[PDB]
C-alpha cells in the first residue's frame, strides 16, 4: 500500500503546532520502532525551520550502537548534530529536554573511543546558551561539559560557563538526576585547583560533601580526600563541616581516610622533615585513589607558609638564618625561592645583597585609590539582583497550600 | 588587550573546523599565544592535548616547547638562549618577537620590586643586555649605580537612589 519512512514523518508536525508538548519527546524517541537513516531524508523536503525536531531523534538512535555504520566514515554523523544547533537551532527544545540532553551524553559516549573527543566541545557549548536567558543556568548540558573539560585538557571553554555564578536550574519536564548534581561539583573543582583558584575550589568541593546520601559513593569518597588537601594550603587546619551535612562522612568517608586526617596534624607542627615521611609511607593510598599530583602542592605550600608565618615574628632575617628553620639546605636556595613569591603575588619583600640580608615587609596599599569604590559597586549589583529573585520565589509557595 | 582577541578567535577554529584530530599550525598558534601572557598552567595543559605522533612528526612545535620549559622553572637567562635555536617562518615568527620583548619586561617588574640592591654582574643575565649596556639604561631612567662594587640600586548619584527605595520598601 505504501512505505511506513512516509508515515511517520508526517506526526511530529501535529504536536508542534498544538500546546501539547509533551507527547513530541516521546515520538522522536523511538522513531516509530525502526532503526534506520531514512527519516534524516524526508525532513529536508518537508521541513518547516529546517530540519524540525525529529532529526535529533535519529542521530540519537544510532549512537546507541556505539560503533560505524560502514567504512571508517563516522564524520558524517559528526557534522550533521553541528548544523542542527548551530543554524537550526531549535524553538521546542524546552519541552523535549529528555531526548535533548540525552543526545549530548551519546555524542561524547560514541567520540572518545573513536580519534580524540574534540569537536563535542563546540557542539555542547552551543547547546548551553540557548537554554540560559543570560543569568548562568544549570542543567543535565552543563554537566556534561566539566567532563569534556577533563579529557581535553583545554580550561578555556570552561572560563565564561563558570566565572559567574549560577542559580535557578531550568527544569519544566524533567531533565536532572542526584548524580549530576555530585559529578558537576566535583568536576568543577578541578578547574580552580589547577587555574591557582582556591579561594573558589573550596566552595565548589563543600556543596558535594554537604548533600546528604544513604550510603558510600566513589563521587563522595573523592571529595572529601580533595577537600583537606585544598584546605591545607590556604590554611593551616581544615575547615569543620555544616549542620545539614550528611552523617555519612562523619562516620564512613573519616575512618577511611585516615591517610588524609593525619597529614593535617603534622601541618600544624610545621616541619618539613617529618612531613617528607607521610608522603612514601601513604604512597600506596594515593595510587590506589587516583590522587597523584594534589598531594605535591601541599609540600610547597609548607615552605611558602614558614616565609609568611617569620614576617609576622621577624622583620629583617638574615639569609643563612632563614636556611635553618625553613631548612632549604644553604643561603643560595633561599634566594631562588623567595624569588617565586614576588611574580605570584603572595607576599611582597626585598632582599638586600649589600648586608646579606632580606626584608619582609607589608602591604603599603591603604585601599583609597578610586577603583576600590568601583568594585563594591559591582558586587553590590548582584546582592540587590539575588534578593529580588528570592521575593519572586517566595510568593509562589505562599500561593501554594502548605502546612 | 591586542593579542588577547587573537587567543579568543583562534580556540573557537579548534572546536568546530577539525572532527578529531586537528591541525600542526593551529596547534602551534595557541601555545605560543599562552607563553605570552605567562600562563603557564595553560600552556602545560595545551600541550598534554596534543597526540604524541603529531610531536613526533612536526619538529616546529618541540622548539615552541622549549622555549617554555624554562619559563615554568623561571630561569631568565635561560630565555634567549632557547628563542634563537628554533623558529618557524610561518605564523609563530611575528608571535615569537613578542615573546622576547615580555621576557625583559618581566624582569623590569620583578628586579624592581624584590632586588633593591641587585648586583650589576647578575643583573646583565635577567634583561639579555651586556653588562656594558645594562649600566647605561638604569642611568638615563633614575636609577643609581655604585663603582668599584659592581652594585646597581632600583627601587555615582544614580547608584545611590536606587539602594534607597530599595531597602526601605
Same mark, same amino acid.
Not at chain 1, 569543620?240 to 568517608?253: A, E, W
Not at chain 1, 638564618?321 to 643560595?332: C, E, I
Not at chain 2, 649605580?145 to 530599595?166: E, G, H, I, K
Given at each position: 500500500?505504501?512505505?511506513?519512512?512516509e508515515?511517520?514523518?508526517?506526526?511530529?508536525?501535529?504536536?508542534?503546532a498544538?500546546?501539547?508538548?509533551?507527547?513530541?519527546?516521546?515520538?522522536?524517541?523511538?522513531?516509530?520502532?525502526?532503526?534506520a537513516?531514512?527519516?534524516?531524508?524526508?525532513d529536508?523536503?518537508?521541513?518547516?525551520?529546517?530540519?524540525?525536531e525529529?532529526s535529533?531523534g535519529?542521530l540519537?538512535?544510532?549512537?546507541?550502537?556505539?560503533?560505524m555504520?560502514?567504512?571508517p566514515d563516522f564524520?558524517?554523523?559528526?557534522?550533521q548534530?553541528?548544523?542542527?544547533?548551530?543554524?537550526?537551532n531549535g524553538?521546542h527544545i524546552?519541552?523535549?529536554?529528555?531526548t535533548f540532553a540525552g543526545?549530548c551524553?551519546?555524542?561524547?559516549?560514541?567520540?572518545?573511543? &573513536?580519534?580524540?573527543?574534540? &569537536?563535542g566541545?563546540?557542539?555542547?557549548?552551543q547547546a548551553?546558551?540557548?537554554?540560559?536567558?543570560?543569568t548562568?543556568?544549570?542543567?543535565?548540558?552543563?554537566?556534561?561539559?566539566?567532563?569534556?573539560?577533563?579529557?581535553a585538557?583545554?580550561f578555556?571553554?570552561?572560563?565564561?560557563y563558570?566565572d559567574v555564578?549560577?542559580?535557578?536550574?531550568?527544569?519544566e519536564?524533567?531533565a536532572?538526576?542526584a548524580?549530576?548534581?555530585?559529578?558537576?561539583?566535583?568536576?568543577?573543582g578541578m578547574?580552580?585547583?589547577?587555574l591557582?583558584?582556591?579561594?573558589?575550589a573550596?566552595?565548589?568541593?563543600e556543596?558535594?560533601?554537604?548533600?546528604?546520601?544513604?550510603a558510600? #559513593?566513589?563521587?563522595?569518597?573523592?571529595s572529601?580526600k580533595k577537600?583537606?588537601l585544598?584546605?591545607?594550603?590556604?590554611?593551616?587546619?581544615?575547615?569543620?563541616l555544616?549542620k545539614?551535612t #550528611?552523617?555519612?562522612?562523619?562516620?564512613f568517608?573519616?575512618?577511611?581516610?585516615?591517610?588524609y586526617?593525619?597529614?593535617?596534624?603534622?601541618?600544624?607542627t610545621?616541619?618539613?622533615?617529618?612531613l617528607r615521611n607521610?608522603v612514601?609511607?601513604?604512597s600506596?593510598?594515593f595510587?590506589?585513589?587516583?590522587?597523584?599530583? =594534589?598531594?605535591?602542592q601541599?609540600?610547597?605550600?609548607?615552605?611558602?607558609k614558614?616565609?609568611? &608565618?617569620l614576617?609576622?615574628?621577624?622583620?629583617t632575617? #638574615?639569609?643563612?638564618?632563614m636556611?635553618?628553620?625553613?631548612?632549604?639546605?644553604?643561603?643560595?636556595?633561599?634566594?631562588?625561592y623567595?624569588?617565586?613569591?614576588?611574580?605570584?603575588?603572595?607576599?611582597?619583600?626585598?632582599?638586600?645583597?649589600?648586608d646579606?640580608?632580606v626584608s619582609?615587609?607589608?602591604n603599603p596599599?591603604?585601599?583609597?585609590?578610586?577603583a576600590?569604590?568601583?568594585?563594591i559597586?559591582?558586587?553590590?549589583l548582584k546582592?540587590?539582583?539575588?534578593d529580588?529573585?528570592?521575593?519572586?520565589?517566595?510568593?509562589?509557595?505562599?500561593?501554594?497550600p502548605?502546612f | 588587550?591586542?593579542?588577547?582577541?587573537?587567543?579568543d578567535?583562534?580556540?573557537?577554529?579548534?572546536?568546530?573546523?577539525?572532527?578529531g584530530?586537528?591541525?600542526?599550525?593551529?596547534?602551534?598558534?595557541?601555545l605560543?599565544?599562552?607563553?605570552l601572557?605567562?600562563?603557564m598552567?595553560?600552556?602545560r595543559?595545551?600541550?598534554?592535548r596534543?597526540?604524541?605522533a603529531?610531536?613526533s612528526?612536526?619538529?616546529?612545535?618541540?622548539?615552541?616547547?622549549?622555549?617554555g620549559?624554562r619559563?615554568?622553572?623561571?630561569?631568565?637567562?635561560?630565555?634567549?638562549?632557547?628563542?634563537?635555536?628554533?623558529?618557524?617562518?610561518?605564523?609563530?615568527?611575528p608571535?615569537?618577537?613578542?615573546? &622576547?620583548?615580555?621576557?625583559?619586561?618581566?624582569?623590569?617588574?620583578?628586579?624592581?620590586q624584590?632586588?633593591?640592591?641587585?648586583?650589576?654582574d647578575?643583573?646583565a643575565?635577567?634583561?639579555?643586555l651586556?653588562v656594558?649596556?645594562?649600566?647605561?639604561?638604569?642611568?638615563?631612567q633614575?636609577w643609581?649605580?655604585?663603582?668599584?662594587?659592581?652594585?646597581?640600586?632600583?627601587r555615582? =548619584?544614580?547608584?545611590l537612589?536606587?539602594?534607597?527605595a530599595?531597602?526601605?520598601?
Amino acid at each position: 500500500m505504501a512505505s511506513a519512512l512516509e508515515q511517520f514523518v508526517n506526526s511530529v508536525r501535529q504536536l508542534s503546532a498544538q500546546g501539547q508538548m509533551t507527547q513530541l519527546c516521546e515520538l522522536i524517541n523511538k522513531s516509530g520502532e525502526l532503526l534506520a537513516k531514512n527519516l534524516s531524508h524526508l525532513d529536508t523536503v518537508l521541513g518547516a525551520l529546517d530540519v524540525q525536531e525529529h532529526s535529533l531523534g535519529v542521530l540519537a538512535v544510532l549512537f546507541v550502537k556505539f560503533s560505524m555504520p560502514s567504512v571508517p566514515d563516522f564524520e558524517t554523523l559528526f557534522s550533521q548534530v553541528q548544523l542542527f544547533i548551530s543554524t537550526c537551532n531549535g524553538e521546542h527544545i524546552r519541552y523535549a529536554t529528555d531526548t535533548f540532553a540525552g543526545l549530548c551524553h551519546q555524542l561524547t559516549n560514541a567520540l572518545v573511543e &573513536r580519534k580524540q573527543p574534540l &569537536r563535542g566541545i563546540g557542539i555542547l557549548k552551543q547547546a548551553i546558551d540557548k537554554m540560559q536567558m543570560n543569568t548562568n543556568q544549570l542543567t543535565s548540558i552543563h554537566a556534561d561539559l566539566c567532563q569534556l573539560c577533563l579529557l581535553a585538557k583545554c580550561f578555556k571553554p570552561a572560563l565564561p560557563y563558570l566565572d559567574v555564578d549560577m542559580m535557578d536550574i531550568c527544569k519544566e519536564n524533567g531533565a536532572y538526576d542526584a548524580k549530576h548534581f555530585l559529578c558537576y561539583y566535583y568536576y568543577g573543582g578541578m578547574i580552580y585547583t589547577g587555574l591557582k583558584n582556591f579561594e573558589r575550589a573550596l566552595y565548589f568541593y563543600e556543596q558535594a560533601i554537604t548533600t546528604p546520601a544513604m550510603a558510600v #559513593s566513589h563521587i563522595m569518597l573523592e571529595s572529601y580526600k580533595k577537600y583537606i588537601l585544598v584546605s591545607l594550603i590556604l590554611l593551616g587546619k581544615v575547615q569543620q563541616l555544616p549542620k545539614y551535612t #550528611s552523617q555519612i562522612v562523619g562516620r564512613f568517608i573519616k575512618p577511611l581516610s585516615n591517610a588524609y586526617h593525619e597529614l593535617a596534624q603534622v601541618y600544624s607542627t610545621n616541619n618539613p622533615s617529618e612531613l617528607r615521611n607521610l608522603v612514601n609511607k601513604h604512597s600506596e593510598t594515593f595510587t590506589r585513589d587516583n590522587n597523584m599530583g =594534589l598531594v605535591k602542592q601541599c609540600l610547597s605550600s609548607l615552605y611558602k607558609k614558614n616565609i609568611q &608565618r617569620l614576617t609576622k615574628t621577624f622583620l629583617t632575617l #638574615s639569609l643563612q638564618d632563614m636556611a635553618s628553620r625553613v631548612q632549604l639546605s644553604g643561603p643560595q636556595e633561599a634566594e631562588k625561592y623567595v624569588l617565586h613569591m614576588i611574580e605570584d603575588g603572595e607576599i611582597f619583600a626585598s632582599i638586600n645583597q649589600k648586608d646579606g640580608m632580606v626584608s619582609f615587609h607589608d602591604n603599603p596599599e591603604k585601599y583609597n585609590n578610586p577603583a576600590m569604590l568601583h568594585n563594591i559597586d559591582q558586587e553590590m549589583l548582584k546582592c540587590i539582583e539575588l534578593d529580588e529573585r528570592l521575593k519572586a520565589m517566595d510568593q509562589e509557595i505562599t500561593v501554594n497550600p502548605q502546612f | 588587550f591586542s593579542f588577547k582577541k587573537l587567543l579568543d578567535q583562534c580556540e573557537n577554529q579548534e572546536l568546530e573546523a577539525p572532527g578529531g584530530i586537528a591541525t600542526p599550525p593551529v596547534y602551534g598558534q595557541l601555545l605560543a599565544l599562552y607563553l605570552l601572557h605567562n600562563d603557564m598552567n595553560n600552556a602545560r595543559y595545551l600541550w598534554k592535548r596534543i597526540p604524541p605522533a603529531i610531536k613526533s612528526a612536526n619538529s616546529e612545535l618541540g622548539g615552541i616547547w622549549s622555549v617554555g620549559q624554562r619559563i615554568w622553572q623561571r630561569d631568565f637567562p635561560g630565555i634567549y638562549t632557547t628563542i634563537n635555536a628554533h623558529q618557524w617562518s610561518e605564523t609563530v615568527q611575528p608571535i615569537m618577537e613578542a615573546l &622576547r620583548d615580555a621576557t625583559r619586561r618581566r624582569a623590569f617588574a620583578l628586579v624592581s620590586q624584590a632586588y633593591t640592591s641587585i648586583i650589576a654582574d647578575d643583573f646583565a643575565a635577567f634583561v639579555g643586555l651586556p653588562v656594558e649596556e645594562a649600566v647605561k639604561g638604569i642611568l638615563e631612567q633614575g636609577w643609581q649605580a655604585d663603582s668599584t662594587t659592581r652594585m646597581v640600586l632600583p627601587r555615582q =548619584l544614580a547608584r545611590l537612589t536606587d539602594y534607597v527605595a530599595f531597602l526601605e520598601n
